[model samples]
Target: RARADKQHVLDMLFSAFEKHQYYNLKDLVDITKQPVVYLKEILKEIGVQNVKGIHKNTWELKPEYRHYQ
Candidate 1:
């Protein structure tokens, strides 16, 4: 059950990235339908980064890690 739940969350994240390369907390919540705390946990596990500068607080998959194709 735990493994299944983890896979589901991963699929949600992948789906989100396929739609958009960048996202914020609100976007993740909307995409996963999961709470911010849980989303953050998953993001951390997956190595998503909180990019700064022009992108500001947006989170993105690492360049080498993105496989949206």
Candidate 2:
């Protein structure tokens, strides 16, 4: 297969962010089954931002994009 559908993966990632605020590369790879590089780009395209420190190398979805309860 070429790759996971872009819009499809976007939905998956968005849903994941609803359950949790941040995710690391390994976690996403396991969850999406998508290549690391491609997943990174998808996160970027969705305005997800990465951070360091206590959370380490994890990405956070912008609150405006999520309304998880």
Candidate 3:
């Protein structure tokens, strides 16, 4: 399995977020089919918000960053 490029990972995450507003780390792994560490690094660069508490480790795009609008 080849490592995903930055654009590919960005596209995958954007598409996933457009389809579903919320996701956990595991969900991102499933969407990207990449390692958790790799995906987390990408998510951090994209400014994805990590929701704590009952949300556990859920992530979401900021309002201004949402593409589904």
In TM-score terms, which candidate is top? 2
Ten residues in sequence with the least summed lDDT for candidate 1: 60-69
The ten-residue window of minimal lDDT in model 2 covers: 60-69
Q: Could you give candidate 1's per-residue lDDT for residues 1-69 as a string of tens digits? A: 556766777777778888888888877777767667767776676647666777666776565665543
TM-score of 3: 0.67
Q: What is the TM-score of each candidate against the true structure?
A: 0.67, 0.69, 0.67
Tell me how far the alpha carbon of residue 1 in candidate 2 is from the true structure, in angstroms, after superposition: 11
Clash totals for all models, in order? Answer: 0, 0, 0
How well is each residue in 1-68 modelled by candidate 2, as lDDT tens digits? 54447767767777887788788888888887877888787677555655667757888655575544
Over 4 Å off, model 2: 1-4, 63-69
RMSD of 2: 4.0
Model 1 residue 61 CA deviation (Å) reads 2.9
**Which ranking of candidates, highest lDDT first?**
2, 3, 1
What are the lDDT scores of the predictions, listed in order?
0.71, 0.72, 0.71
